[PDB]
């Protein structure tokens, strides 16, 4: 066979730094939680429901064993809610000045949440840049276009 699944050689799935103290990504494996700690990450905020087929059996244990704080905010991909975004904003406020990873499976939910947080915080994130993991899919997901629109409606820049 030829070289297979080269992405497994390329680190954390869908990793994208969003700010000096904020990472967004897809799903870190167990080893990568140790790497995250070594890179200075203090808090892992997980938006992927534990019922998902890709979920770790006990991510909180992996995170806490690696020396970090764990926050679990399960966001239903097929039913995002404003209250999910508010829970995320609340978790961020409880960890001010700390290095945070927000993640899901492939960095759709996490990049969107990171975007809305930076918007609310007055950081004027570039949406096209922040939400790179979405490529041109947002319009294909009306529930997500709705969420982004409603939360954005509350703020300026």
Binding region for Cl ion (CB under 5 A) = 11, 78, 125-126, 129-130
Residue 38 or 126 with smaller CB distance to Cl ion: 126
Residue 94 or 146 with smaller CB distance to Cl ion: 146
Residue 31 or 94 with smaller CB distance to Cl ion: 31
Smallest gap from Cβ 129 to Cl ion, in A, equals 5
Smallest gap from Cβ 82 to Cl ion, in A, equals 17
Smallest gap from Cβ 153 to Cl ion, in A, equals 20
HEC secondary structure over the chain: CCCCCHHHHCCCCCCEEEECCEEEECCCCHHHHHHHHHCCCCEEEECCCCCCCCCCCCHHHHHHHCCCEEEECCCCCCCCCHHHHHHHHHHHHCCCCCCEEEECCCCHHHHHHHHHHHHHCCCCCCHHHHCHHHCCCHHHCHHHHHHHHHHHHCCCC
Smallest gap from Cβ 134 to Cl ion, in A, equals 14
Residue 24 or 94 with smaller CB distance to Cl ion: 24
């Amino acid at each position: 066979g030829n070289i297979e699944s080269i992405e497994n050689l390329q680190g954390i799935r869908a990793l994208q730094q969003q700010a000096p103290q904020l990472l967004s990504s897809g799903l870190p494996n167990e080893q990568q939680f140790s790497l995250l700690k070594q890179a200075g990450v203090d808090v892992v905020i997980n938006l992927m429901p534990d019922s998902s087929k890709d979920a770790h059996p006990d991510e909180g244990k992996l995170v806490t064993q690696a020396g970090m704080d764990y926050v679990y905010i399960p966001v239903d991909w097929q039913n995002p809610k404003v209250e999910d975004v508010e829970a995320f904003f609340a978790a961020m406020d409880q960890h001010k000045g700390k290095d945070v990873l927000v993640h899901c499976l492939a960095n759709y939910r996490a990049s969107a949440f990171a975007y809305l947080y930076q918007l609310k915080q007055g950081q004027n994130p570039n949406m096209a840049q922040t939400m790179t993991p979405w490529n041109d899919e947002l319009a294909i997901y009306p529930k997500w276009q709705a969420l982004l629109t409603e939360v954005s409606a509350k703020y300026g820049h």
